[PDB]
Design a protein around this ligand. Structure first.
Ligand code: NAD
Ligand code: NAD
Ligand code: UPG
Ligand code: UPG
Lengths: 390, 390
């Protein structure tokens, strides 16, 4: 099967591209590498140095003999997207190619607008390319667990059966995103759902939880295949950030009360889940929604786990309460359902002492490359302005 | 109070601008007049000839002495929007400035993309301008009854209290839009809701039903104040279209079975409802949602009413079943709640024999200007392509 991995130079995308290639799918990467430009523009950098996309692909070929095709361009440019689609003829498209940082989407008006335009229009272009050049192509889209917000009821996998005023129906689960980025994903999902019904498009919305980890079987095969590990306050996420903080001796940055609860999963399960979604495709006109995560953790819980893990390495981990830059519930009910992927055969890598030990040791050995100036958050949800920030 | 009417040269906007001015609000119109360009580009034309926005405003001033300020520009251009906002300093902003045609949004990829970009980004710009230049400014947004789709349960006014797995919560009503235009409104609503919570913005989402009629007290005061009446298959809507069809002797174009049910309201109630929303503003951080319509009608019901009304004028109205160009339920349950505006004092103009007689006679007297080539729909929801159509 032929798979087009949009956003394949990214964190989830690169790991996924290699895995699918290893699993014998014909693979191509469609990416404009704008994420790398963001690093330069904001003064950010991955904990570990990564190779250029060209050297990454060249190394994979040198090691395995397998060639991952590369199309460098902006999917918002339909001419480029159309040519890439016609040239590659994918059977499946995995869409990781979007501005995914919540903080980034809240920097200022221009970045909030860029986030929504890039994400929503790019996804519309993908739907139109599938419809026009390969209507049977299965779209595996990365949505977000953030689409559901934190309601006082159980979170289902995309749909909910409601009995209202004596009548019953199964409707899309109410969405309550808390950032312009999270909102763009909600828009994506609604747009895709419509095309499934109107055009018979087949798609799977993967509402993934926060990803942690840097190693996967494929990326560890050579230094040039190494994935990125972000720890800064813009693109870095909770667990990965805490591990790097522990390694450099910086107190764990708990935003607000720390009761914020979310689903999490090892990057190794990210690639596994995407492969399962590709191997067991949605039917024509079907809009599948999977809650893609393996375990739920509160920020405080992650803090304790990293502290305990850090102790075994004599890191004497400390914690600190950072005035929350975000607007969100810091104490809330959280029970998100996740059985669809398990039902399809998912064999999860639950968070372990071994994983934390590995990730912490990894951070310690590259600690010299950590720019501590990027650890504390400087993007306010409430103070967001119109002047383009530098 | 000062009111900024974005989209004030349009059908709902012009009638509303005049009404608010008459009601003694200081009013300005922000419009790029792109709707007029669409008419030229698609070969469409209003049943009745309308004056230029400049002559419209000049006439109002000549008659009443009141001056409606005019800012001509694209709200997607923040520089222009920011300058207009700072120059006018509105206490309320009524947002009618969006691509509102469902068929238009389905013409091809470029038009679907234009619809979502123009609508979503323009609305984001409005929210940022309010936040930055007048945070207390009340946003009265035009959403759409189409956001709810046609579920098997009662449709509430924006929110629904659900009891799921033994827990209760009031959540946003599940959205199921059936066109790229309707979808853009869903995105708008989700975006606005977020800013109300994150920034304390105060807004009222007016999910209006289909509007019918051409006369309002103000627009009838002089020919140059005349509003537009669309009958073509792109911008024309059900009732208005049927009345013009009856007048020219064209069979009423019933799409599919004709069981499609929706809420409707006289344009006179449109201006009344907007004024009520402005006079009784939302509180800081509040996202009010009103279902703005006065009565529910199926297409078949409208067909019968127009036929009966046309009989009294000896029009011998005929009906025809047109293969539905749209993907939608042609027979469905429909019970949409609408009491919030009534509770705030709305005095509705329910559809009457008098209204139909007036509108039909109006169409008959301008029947010579009707381009019958534009009556039948030529935009398919399913056959939509990527090539920009001419
Ligand atoms: N990182 C996590 O913790 C996490 C968690 C859940 C879901 N996801 C989701 O997975 C997806 C990818 O995330 P990631 O962490 O790998 O992000 P990333 O920023 O590392 O990768 C995204 C890639 O997409 C590319 N891209 C962006 N816009 C593009 C465009 N217009 N055209 C072509 N390419 C474009 C970027 O250059 C980049 O290489 C996103 O949808 C994200 O929300 C990630
Ligand atoms: N017509 C109806 O039956 C109906 C029904 C329910 C809701 N509404 C809603 O009311 C609003 C206005 O509808 P209408 O029928 O008056 O439409 P219209 O096309 O007559 O008016 C819209 C106006 O907005 C302007 N506009 C569009 N994009 C703009 C931009 N980027 N910058 C500045 N101005 C811009 C256009 O030039 C036009 O004058 C829409 O949100 C619509 O969905 C209309
Ligand atoms: O140092 C930190 C970082 C985060 N948080 C909190 O932990 C939670 C999770 O935040 P984070 O790890 O930054 O993830 P999100 O901002 O939710 O976003 C990531 O995880 C989402 C999961 O849905 C994806 O959609 C996004 O693309 C991805 O960037 C939030 O409550 C944060 O406020 C902290 O307390 N301390
Ligand atoms: O000649 C016609 C025209 C329409 N319909 C049907 O009647 C219904 C209503 O359609 P229409 O009057 O075209 O309205 P919408 O496309 O729903 O859109 C209008 O009414 C919406 C109400 O929510 C607004 O959001 C939009 O901006 C406005 O363009 C639909 O089921 C149509 O398929 C017919 O059967 N025959």
């Amino acid at each position: 099967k032929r798979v087009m991995v949009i956003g394949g130079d990214g964190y989830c995308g690169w790991a996924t591209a290699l895995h699918l290639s290893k699993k014998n799918y014909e693979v191509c990467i469609v990416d404009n590498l704008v994420r790398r430009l963001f690093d330069h523009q904001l003064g950010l950098e991955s904990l570990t140095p990564i190779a250029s996309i060209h050297d990454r692909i060249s190394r994979w070929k040198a090691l395995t003999g397998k060639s991952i095709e590369l199309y460098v361009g902006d999917i918002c440019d339909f001419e480029f997207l159309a040519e890439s689609f016609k040239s590659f003829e994918p059977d499946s498209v995995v869409h990781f190619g979007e501005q995914r940082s919540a903080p980034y989407s809240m920097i200022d008006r221009s970045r909030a607008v860029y986030t929504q335009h890039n994400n929503v229009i790019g996804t519309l272009n993908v739907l139109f390319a599938i419809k026009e050049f390969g209507e049977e192509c299965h779209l595996v889209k990365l949505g977000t667990m953030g689409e559901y917000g934190t309601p006082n009821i159980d979170i289902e996998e995309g749909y909910i059966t409601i009995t209202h005023n004596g009548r019953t129906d199964t409707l899309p689960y109410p969405k309550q995103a808390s950032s312009f980025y999270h909102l763009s994903k909600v828009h994506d999902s609604h747009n895709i759902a419509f095309t499934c019904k109107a055009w018979g498009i087949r798609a799977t919305d993967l509402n993934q939880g926060v990803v942690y980890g840097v190693k996967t079987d494929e990326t560890e095969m050579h230094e040039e295949l190494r994935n990125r590990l972000d720890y800064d306050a813009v693109f870095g996420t909770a667990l990965n950030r805490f591990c790097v903080q522990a390694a450099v001796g910086h107190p764990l940055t708990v935003y607000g009360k720390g009761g914020q609860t979310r689903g999490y999963l090892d990057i190794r399960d990210t690639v596994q889940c995407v492969e399962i979604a590709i191997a067991n495709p949605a039917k024509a006109g079907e809009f599948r929604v999977f809650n893609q995560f393996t375990e739920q953790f509160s920020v405080n819980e992650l803090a304790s786990l990293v502290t305990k893990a850090g102790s075994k390495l004599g890191l004497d981990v400390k914690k600190m309460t950072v005035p929350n830059p975000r607007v969100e519930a810091e104490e809330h009910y959280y029970n998100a359902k996740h059985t669809k992927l398990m039902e399809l055969g998912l064999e999860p890598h639950y968070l372990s002492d071994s994983l934390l030990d590995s990730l912490l040791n990894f951070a310690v050995q590259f600690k010299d490359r950590v720019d501590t100036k990027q650890i504390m958050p400087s993007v306010s949800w409430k103070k967001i302005g119109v002047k383009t920030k530098s």
